[PDB]
């Protein structure tokens, strides 16, 4: 028995972790109305996508990985001795990458495909990947890993801040004058993930209190966990994510695992500019 672990590109793992563990990636795409397509990878210039997103008069569309992209890596991993494949996917409540990962694995013979619904995104979804690899090396069989990843999912979440009432209007969720009810007013909607779905939490003015809202909300949850792994997931506002990341290191004991990361074009296409999140895991995930 040999078990492999792969995922889609929305888990935004570091290129070091991908290269070290040979993690195969099924990329998501984002197509603008200009005809230009950005296939998610660690080769694009994220700053130039943000400029293109601000350039484009309309917000682009997102697409899950093509079924053929899942197949070629599935049959590849099979064509090297892997008896089982664990697939951590983007949350099925927000995307169709989990549906395509299951159906494509049914069309690949010789290996047992195990699609997992992360019920989240970004490095929090990537934490499931690093936890699956850690268990495979320890000598765990697939359903033992899925049972653990299902248990880890019960103590895992992510809050996020949206600072782009602009981008919220070109998508049709707020009217033209509603942007001029928050932008001048500096109102920041605060959302959170629940059961794989993005539901509204609070609407805190100023980004500072909204960031302080993220800290107090996540710290009050993880204070009852035996193991804690925090992840600052920042957008194109570098100073905002670092201020929260540094404030966390000062306010949290070193027993807590505090990490920094950034999301890519697919997640940014829906968040816009200045997006910022804060996720947590009830486990001491191996990030090395
Ligand atoms: C930084 C906080 C994480 C925010 C995650 C936003 C996810 C919403 C975008 C949904 C992407 C759907 C992808 C697809 O079309 O298949």
Numbering used by the authors: 1 to 288
From the paper:
We identified two alanine residues (121 and 158) in the tunnel and mutated them to bulkier residues to partially occlude the FA-binding pocket and push the FA out of its pocket to destabilize the fully closed FakB1 conformation. We also determined the 2.33 Å crystal structure of FakB1(A158L), which was structurally identical to FakB1(A121I). The open FakB1(A158L) molA structure superimposes on the FakB1(A121I) molA structure with an RMSD of 0.265 Å. A similar process occurs in FakB1(A158L). First, compared with the wild-type protein, the thermal stabilities of FakB1(A121I) and FakB1(A158L) were reduced by 6 °C and 4 °C, respectively, showing that the mutations indeed prevent FakB1 from adopting its most stable conformation. When expressed in Escherichia coli, the total amount of FA incorporated by the FakB1 mutant proteins was the same as the wild-type protein, but FakB1 only supported the incorporation of palmitic acid (16:0), whereas both mutant proteins were less specific and also incorporated oleate (18:1) and linoleate (18:2). The FakB1(A121I) and FakB1(A158L) crystal structures capture the open conformation that is generated by the introduction of bulkier side chains into the FA-binding pocket and stabilized by the crystal packing architecture that creates a surrogate hydrophobic environment that favors the formation of helix α8′.
